[PDB]
Amino acid sequence: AMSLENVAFNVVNKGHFDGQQGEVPVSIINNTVYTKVDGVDVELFENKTTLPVNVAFELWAKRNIKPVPEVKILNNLGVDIAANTVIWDYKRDAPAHISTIGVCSMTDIAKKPTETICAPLTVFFDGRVDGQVDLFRNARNGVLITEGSVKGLQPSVGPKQASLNGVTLIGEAVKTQFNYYKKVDGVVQQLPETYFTQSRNLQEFKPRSQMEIDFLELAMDEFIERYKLEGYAFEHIVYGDFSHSQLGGLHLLIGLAKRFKESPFELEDFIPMDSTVKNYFITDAQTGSSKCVCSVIDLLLDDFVEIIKSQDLSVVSKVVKVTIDYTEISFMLWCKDGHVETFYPKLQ
Amino acid sequence: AMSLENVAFNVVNKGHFDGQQGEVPVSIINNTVYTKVDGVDVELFENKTTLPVNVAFELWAKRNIKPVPEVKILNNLGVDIAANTVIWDYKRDAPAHISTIGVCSMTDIAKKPTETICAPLTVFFDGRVDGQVDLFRNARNGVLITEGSVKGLQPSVGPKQASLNGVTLIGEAVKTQFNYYKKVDGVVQQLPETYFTQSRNLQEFKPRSQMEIDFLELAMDEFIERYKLEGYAFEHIVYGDFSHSQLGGLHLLIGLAKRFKESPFELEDFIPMDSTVKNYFITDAQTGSSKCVCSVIDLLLDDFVEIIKSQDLSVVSKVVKVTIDYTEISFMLWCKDGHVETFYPKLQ
Amino acid sequence: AMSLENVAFNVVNKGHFDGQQGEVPVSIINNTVYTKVDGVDVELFENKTTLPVNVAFELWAKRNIKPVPEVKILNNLGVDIAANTVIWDYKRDAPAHISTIGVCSMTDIAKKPTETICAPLTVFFDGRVDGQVDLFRNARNGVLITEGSVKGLQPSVGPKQASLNGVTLIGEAVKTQFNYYKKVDGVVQQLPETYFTQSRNLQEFKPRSQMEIDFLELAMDEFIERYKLEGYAFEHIVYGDFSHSQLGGLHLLIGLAKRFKESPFELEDFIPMDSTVKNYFITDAQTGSSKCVCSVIDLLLDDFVEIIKSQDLSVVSKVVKVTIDYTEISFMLWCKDGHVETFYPKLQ
Amino acid sequence: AMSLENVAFNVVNKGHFDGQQGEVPVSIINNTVYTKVDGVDVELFENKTTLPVNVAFELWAKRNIKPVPEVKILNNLGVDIAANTVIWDYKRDAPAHISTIGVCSMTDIAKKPTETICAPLTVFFDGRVDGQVDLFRNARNGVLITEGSVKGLQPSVGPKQASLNGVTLIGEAVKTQFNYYKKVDGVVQQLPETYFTQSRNLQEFKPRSQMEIDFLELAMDEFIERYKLEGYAFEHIVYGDFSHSQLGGLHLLIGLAKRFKESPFELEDFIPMDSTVKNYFITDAQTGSSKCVCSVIDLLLDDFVEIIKSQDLSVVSKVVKVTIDYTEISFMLWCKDGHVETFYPKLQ
Amino acid sequence: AMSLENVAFNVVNKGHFDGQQGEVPVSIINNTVYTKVDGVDVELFENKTTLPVNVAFELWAKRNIKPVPEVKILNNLGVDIAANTVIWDYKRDAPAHISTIGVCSMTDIAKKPTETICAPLTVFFDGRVDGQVDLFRNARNGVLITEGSVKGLQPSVGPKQASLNGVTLIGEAVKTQFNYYKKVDGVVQQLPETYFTQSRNLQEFKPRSQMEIDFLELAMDEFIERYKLEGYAFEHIVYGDFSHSQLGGLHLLIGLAKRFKESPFELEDFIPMDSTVKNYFITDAQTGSSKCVCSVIDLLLDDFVEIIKSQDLSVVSKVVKVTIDYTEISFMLWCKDGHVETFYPKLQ
Ligand SMILES: Cn1nc(C(N)=O)c2ccccc21
Ligand SMILES: Cn1nc(C(N)=O)c2ccccc21
Numbered sequence A, B, C, D, E: 001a002m003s004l005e006n007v008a009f010n011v012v013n014k015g016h017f018d019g020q021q022g023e024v025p026v027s028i029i030n031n032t033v034y035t036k037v038d039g040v041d042v043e044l045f046e047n048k049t050t051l052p053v054n055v056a057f058e059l060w061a062k063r064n065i066k067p068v069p070e071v072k073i074l075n076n077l078g079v080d081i082a083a084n085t086v087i088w089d090y091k092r093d094a095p096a097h098i099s100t101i102g103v104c105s106m107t108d109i110a111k112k113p114t115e116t117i118c119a120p121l122t123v124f125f126d127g128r129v130d131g132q133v134d135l136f137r138n139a140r141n142g143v144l145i146t147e148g149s150v151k152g153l154q155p156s157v158g159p160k161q162a163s164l165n166g167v168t169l170i171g172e173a174v175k176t177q178f179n180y181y182k183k184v185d186g187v188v189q190q191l192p193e194t195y196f197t198q199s200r201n202l203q204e205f206k207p208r209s210q211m212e213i214d215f216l217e218l219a220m221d222e223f224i225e226r227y228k229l230e231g232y233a234f235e236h237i238v239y240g241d242f243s244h245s246q247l248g249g250l251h252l253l254i255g256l257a258k259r260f261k262e263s264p265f266e267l268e269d270f271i272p273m274d275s276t277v278k279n280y281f282i283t284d285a286q287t288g289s290s291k292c293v294c295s296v297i298d299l300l301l302d303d304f305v306e307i308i309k310s311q312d313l314s315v316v317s318k319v320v321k322v323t324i325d326y327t328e329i330s331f332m333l334w335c336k337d338g339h340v341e342t343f344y345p346k347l348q
Helices: A004-014 A053-061 A071-076 A132-138 A210-217 A220-226 A253-262 A301-309 B004-014 B053-061 B071-076 B132-138 B210-217 B220-226 B253-262 B301-309 C004-014 C053-061 C071-076 C132-138 C210-217 C220-226 C253-262 C301-309 D004-014 D053-061 D071-076 D132-138 D210-217 D220-226 D253-262 D301-309 E004-014 E053-061 E071-076 E132-138 E210-217 E220-226 E253-262 E301-309
Strands: A026-029 A032-037 A040-046 A108-110 A123-126 A142-146 A162-164 A167-169 A179-184 A265-268 A277-284 A290-297 A317-324 A327-336 A339-345 B026-029 B032-037 B040-046 B108-110 B123-126 B142-146 B162-164 B167-169 B179-184 B187-189 B265-268 B277-284 B290-297 B317-324 B327-336 B339-345 C026-029 C032-037 C040-046 C108-110 C123-126 C142-146 C162-164 C167-169 C179-184 C187-189 C265-268 C277-284 C290-297 C317-324 C327-336 C339-345 D026-029 D032-037 D040-046 D108-110 D123-126 D142-146 D162-164 D167-169 D179-184 D187-189 D265-268 D277-284 D290-297 D317-324 D327-336 D339-345 E026-029 E032-037 E040-046 E108-110 E123-126 E142-146 E162-164 E167-169 E179-184 E265-268 E277-284 E290-297 E317-324 E327-336 E339-345
Touching: A004 A026, A004 A032, A004 A040, A004 A053, A004 B004, A026 B053, A032 A053, A040 A053, A053 B026, A123 A132, A132 A142, A210 A220, A210 A253, A210 A301, A253 A265, A253 A290, A290 A339, A290 E004, B004 B026, B004 B032, B004 B040, B004 B053, B004 C290, B032 B053, B040 B053, B123 B132, B132 B142, B210 B220, B210 B253, B210 B301, B253 B265, B253 B290, B290 B339, B290 D004, C004 C026, C004 C032, C004 C040, C004 C053, C004 D290, C004 E004, C026 E053, C032 C053, C040 C053, C053 E026, C123 C132, C132 C142, C210 C220, C210 C253, C210 C301, C253 C265, C253 C290, C290 C339, D004 D026, D004 D032, D004 D040, D004 D053, D032 D053, D040 D053, D123 D132, D132 D142, D210 D220, D210 D253, D210 D301, D253 D265, D253 D290, D290 D339, E004 E026, E004 E032, E004 E040, E004 E053, E032 E053, E040 E053, E123 E132, E132 E142, E210 E220, E210 E253, E210 E301, E253 E265, E253 E290, E290 E339
Parallel strands: A123 A142, B123 B142, C123 C142, D123 D142, E123 E142
Antiparallel strands: A026 A032, A032 A040, A142 A179, A162 A167, A265 A277, A277 A290, A317 A327, A327 A339, B026 B032, B032 B040, B142 B179, B162 B167, B179 B187, B265 B277, B277 B290, B317 B327, B327 B339, C026 C032, C032 C040, C142 C179, C162 C167, C179 C187, C265 C277, C277 C290, C317 C327, C327 C339, D026 D032, D032 D040, D142 D179, D162 D167, D179 D187, D265 D277, D277 D290, D317 D327, D327 D339, E026 E032, E032 E040, E142 E179, E162 E167, E265 E277, E277 E290, E317 E327, E327 E339
16 A cells, blocks of 8 residues: 555664554645644655656655665666666666666556566576576576675676665675676677776775875876876876866766875865766866866776776877776877877767 | 445446445546446546545535535535535535545545534534434534424525525425524524525526516616615616626626626626625626626615615715625625715625 | 757747747746847746656647547547657647657657657557558557548547537537547457547537537426436436535536526636546536536536436446546446436546 | 735735735745735635746736737837736746836836836836826837827727736736837837737627628638639638648638537647637537648638738749738738638748 | 857856857756756856846856956946956856846847947946956047056956956966946046955955954964054954954954964855945854944055044044945944043944
């Protein structure tokens, strides 16, 4: 017996939908859900989605509260819908997927992923839920995550980090590193060799290697000398050039984090969504150097060094394709006299 | 187990709230309630009230579907709230009362009218519901309607007409004429002798006496002669004067109905609500004669003739108080040389 | 180059979307689309749909302006989506279907009905458009209308009437009677033998047979005598019983139309959508007789007489299934001593 | 001391803004203004404008309640703003002009039309208000109406009809025929000789000449014979051709009114505003004959006959410019062998 | 070919409007603009203006992305509109000006500033754009900024800082110090001698002189002694008095910044807009000392010392007018026995 009042009761008493019986009085005004507490209204939810307020409230209450793959990974793997859960997209304040399976009567296209409507869709399956590894076996299209091995299936080791209630973290008390499996038209795929983005924040950036510790601690010329990076344009690409009106390079998150410690800057996230490569309209506060579309990727500095050192530097310009987060990322590589001039995630 | 989805189920299947178990998917967008039918959204309700949409939807679904007193009568009797029902005000598309008793969790001030919060409020009681006459005997303040005798309680015969789902009618298959009773501060109050407004429409006006048939059929001078109305200013008051820029008189609904048959006119209902006396900004289409505040009352022509013929015509101006629909209506009576000049419901 | 301003230009200059190049300034405020004319905003469209205002405006501008099947027929045939057109539902002021094919970038699930997403959906095809009969032959699921013969395809003669810009009519200058064809799972399905509802209004009801002329002109007892309808409960079913608080029978539109000429009544259309059988909360103004759920069907009186006279009258109660508008309508037939007591479209 | 509560007080007590002191409690929710009456909210105004609700409420309360020129006339004369009044556009439910002079603090561009901001704007002046003829003499740009002679100013006799509170009428108790005057760049402009549209409705159309009575009463062939209209294509232009899918002609309101008596039809007013020529998407209910853009003008049939009989019929196609409501209306005249084929207000 | 979809395409791909061809699907819901990215909606813009959402989205996309004068400077100079650009007011999240010239079809009053509508308006001209110095030469009213000298015009050196995408900064990689020119009625003005506000933030306050470094580093009594400020009430005016319920003085930003390092406080910006003097409802968290209207100005401490030391201290109270940011700021100076008691930006 699903209801607005029952969903609200669960949110008030359990912090989310927990299948508990009960009802609380609710008022809906514009895009906000309120509940009466001692005669006064208390805001439970503000709808930031394009779904009707009561529908969005229910999907948000029914969000997955276990560590789940980051939306950018699910998107890159072609996930269309999730089996009997809601992957909440905290970057968009909305459901990661248009439709649901066995979650909400307004958004459900099926109650079970075995229904023929789900056969063409790449359904997300969670091996931590009983019967989902078997539902993936019977699924024509799908992506499966597991914590351990699956008999007869070769795994693709996913990223170390997962999203837990919108907090991207590498789990110590919970497992966040999953094995990934994918099926297309009934055939188990061999997932490609991939790098993973590190999903760090600018304000709380932490190095994850000795090279990253050295980048943040040493001065530009000492670091470039120590790691033999002369001729690889790290001065432009990673450190950033703030001497002209157009901000030069600054495409690796670690470089932005190093700059942030000394001088602040504005990053306008004009397409706010989870993605492998992020585009920002940056304005450096100290210098006034700015760039409308500054593509930024958070790779481990060692992985970025490996990518750039594995390229042919003999052509003026070329597209360099690198598998990152299971997707093909195109980079633009610009060279002159055997040295790099610039290397950036291609704006297309 | 009250819920938005259960209220919607009742509306879809029973035409209103009928206490039936069940749920239908609902979407709320802005001020409208929708339900999915054959894959598409069908509008169930549009909120025209100042309450939250889901709350107004529930009160409207729980509206009283039996003949009930017209809102103007309840207002005139000082009714604040109803016992365990919703009197829906079809003229305002809203609940006739702010709060409820045992109806909706968001608007309820009590579950039963015996609760101390209800003692100062004039509670409406319906003798057609088991135990409501007893609740009126125990209520400190209240208005009771019955279809018959209550032992020891002196009745007041109400109007012949009642509102059934927004249709004001004199019941033939249902009883619409009720006995009325009122209590103030624990004491049964004697309801005054009163006239009743006829609650007719301009477009479907029907005469309810031989005098009313004669007013609509006969010419002005021959009706005034037949009913000995010379010197009573019916030419001004009832027929209306359309010769000057300011429309003269036209305060009885029957006069407007007679005019409507020949020439149309605009009546701007600037305070849209049910009331004994209605104020309209009238514009006569044929002549361009207009009046910002034209007070109009729908009395039976015989009752209006009785009122005007029972007045002393020896003073220039005076207030004439007449009990109509249990309320004291003040009229302004203007005389000259023993004849009426004007007589109108006094604009406060 | 589809755009809001181009859609608005087409509406302003062509009365609808006509593929014309051009732009007009547009302002969107809340759910209304406006355009500047002589320095002031003029309303072009008010969104009554659950889609975003600019999206609903585009689908409405792109509505099919040729005579099209009434939405009740498309629904009864299981139509999910239309091929490269919008069937506008004038009863709901909304698109008859959630999604589109080659119409609008926001609602499109495909550009052509040959795309694999369309295979499971029943696509509506219009033989009057070049290549649509061929697309139906290749579609896994679909409904096709034509003005003539399709080689080798067994036709089903549809209703005489079609909807032209929201006006249901039997075409004299245009063809409104189509041949219908349906495919399920790649296989042409034989459409059943069916009656058709007449799609008439209560206020402008016109008889379409000598029997219907006789029902409206003749008194109840003489019509029943002339057409040998004694023992078939037409007094209850068709004429209606207004003697008790619950309105009896009154399930045929013609009976409501006959009553409407003498006494008015309120019909509350609580699920406002096009359907073969309509449910109304009726309140008779003359008597106060009312019914929360009064199922009403508009059959030709001759067709209803044929249905009722073709039933076995020897059982107390039974479900009578009749194909109407291609759908199986369940009726409840109640008999006593070989005569009908009641016969009504069964309330689910 | 202008205020929302004071405006509301004036509306409640005076039917409009009347400069009276006082305040009533007001609640604003979404686009509606409410006031408390007997403990419940009563709707005073619903904003259908693109202005903020409280601002639109004030302009509507301050609307001119005297007969004023119809908005189509003011527009045709290039009126930008009114001097110290609001011309309310009842066809758009909005102010006819964006800005005000001495009316409302939010919309005012000036308190008096003598302010330099008003010099480039064509200000509407009303000679019925003291000092407005003088303000017109001093205005650089303006339109003046008067009920009589202004010394030395050559008058233009306007239409017989004016708008009084949204009712277009020819005044009997008030004057609706004004003298018009216009100034451009400090210089009094000679207004051209013009025809006037009759501003009639389809549903309440009344003939205003013996020819118009003869058009409505007589059959097509006998009217054309009586008025010697053979070869002028009245069969197409005025009567309308409903034999093909595209509705032919039907450009004079009187022809639509004649058709309306026999068969109803839908007129979609897709640009809802007052204009000399109106464009409708028409659908004839009887035949299914339709036209996306059907230009309709309401001229007196005698005036239309005079216009068409005053044209040279020797060229295949040409633009015929006719001054109507002070504006140049372009008509398309199509001839063959010395006879008219079609003549219609040219679709721009 | 301007369009909503084209503006959205530019925002998605270029970070702002860049004149690029292309379209993306857009949905408008309430006041938010979304775009579809891989089947899900992504928020592009939330309207915080009083303009229609699609219009505000276009002006925001077309905002000037070069360093521009701060809105307080433009306002103080009487700028009404900008020539072919949008000065976006980041403090109000809205366009700094009501109308535009050659920017957006809904807000444009002209395509070029040479149009006669622009002659009375003080048009903002940017010498960094080709032809704008010449358009200022031909403009009757205007303000011109340049980076270098203009032949024949004497410059007014503006502030060192400018706004770059809402970040107020003193440019190192870009020029932010402009020469200002102003014309009124065709005559080049001699701009007055002025101080400039420093436009610093409380949280990231940086000293811009040795005196400012000393104010932040030294204790109150050491600083007052070093700079000979005894008898100038800096203890009250600049440091602030937190000993009584009403917070005393605290009118210079540097004093608030010094306090902020030790104890936090709430500044309620009740009129959120860019202005030379800002008014805050301050509440000191440590003491509970508060003030409803605390006027705060950010002057360089040396400039404030120069202003206060250049006043006559012999009268109880007087208005001291100081040109700051080209506007006349009134200060209230209160003295006793030849010493200052208080000196503050006058609340009027
Ligand atoms: C070997 N194998 N294990 C699985 C599984 N655990 O889901 C599966 C699924 C499809 C095809 C082969 C498979
Ligand atoms: C001498 N002079 N230079 C300019 C200019 N560059 O705009 C100008 C403008 C108006 C009047 C005199 C002027």
